[PDB]
Design a protein around this ligand. Structure first.
Ligand code: WWS
Length: 167
C-alpha cells in the first residue's frame, strides 16, 4: 500500500492521473520523482523548469555541479540526484527531443531507467516540449516499465485522450 491517490489503473503496474507533478510531488513526497531532463541538466522549461522552480533553483545548482564533474548525460540515460523539497530522490531521465531530431527509438531506453526503482512518480517521457506523441510515449511506458509507475499528466484534455485511446 502506498500514498498515491486518485489514480486510474492502466495495467498491473502503471497508473495515471490528471495532476501537476510539482503539486503531486509536494503532497506525496515520493521516494523518486522523475524529471524530464536534457543531457546538460538545464532545467529551463516544461516539467524540468517547473520542478526546478519549485526547489527555488537548488535543483539547477546541484545539476551544474554534477555536469561540471561528470559531463553530459546520454540521450536515453539518467542520473539520480536529490529530490530536494519534492521527493527523496530525483531521477533525471533524458528522453529523445523530437524538436532536436533525436531518434524516437531511444524512448524505450529512456523508460528502462525506471526499472531500477520500485516505485516512481513520473511524467510521460518525450511528451510536451520534447515533441513526441504522448500516446506513443504511454504505449512505450506500459511495454517497458515493470516497476510501479504513477504518471502525472498536467493537461486534462490530454489525460482524457490518453485514457480513452488506451489499448
Ligand atoms: N508541471 C508540468 N509541466 C509540464 N508537463 C508536461 C510535460 C510532460 C512531459 C515532458 Cl517531457 C515535458 N512536459 C507536465 N506533466 C506533468 N507535470 C507537468
Amino acid at each position: 500500500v502506498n500514498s498515491f491517490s486518485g489514480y486510474l489503473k492502466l495495467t498491473d503496474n502503471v497508473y495515471i492521473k490528471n495532476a501537476d507533478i510539482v503539486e503531486e510531488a509536494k503532497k506525496v513526497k515520493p521516494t523518486v520523482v522523475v524529471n524530464a531532463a536534457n543531457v546538460y541538466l538545464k532545467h529551463g522549461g516544461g516539467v524540468a523548469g517547473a520542478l526546478n522552480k519549485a526547489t527555488n533553483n537548488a535543483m539547477q545548482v546541484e545539476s551544474d555541479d554534477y555536469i561540471a564533474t561528470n559531463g553530459p548525460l546520454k540521450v536515453g540515460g539518467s542520473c539520480v540526484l536529490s529530490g530536494h523539497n519534492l521527493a527523496k530522490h530525483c531521477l533525471h531521465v533524458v528522453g529523445p527531443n523530437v524538436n532536436k531530431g533525436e531518434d524516437i527509438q531511444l524512448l524505450k531506453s529512456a523508460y528502462e531507467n525506471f526499472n531500477q526503482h520500485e516505485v516512481l512518480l513520473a511524467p510521460l517521457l518525450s511528451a510536451g516540449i520534447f515533441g513526441a506523441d504522448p500516446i506513443h510515449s504511454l504505449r512505450v511506458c506500459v511495454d517497458t516499465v515493470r516497476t510501479n509507475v504513477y504518471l502525472a499528466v498536467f493537461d486534462k484534455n490530454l489525460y482524457d485522450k490518453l485514457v480513452s485511446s488506451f489499448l
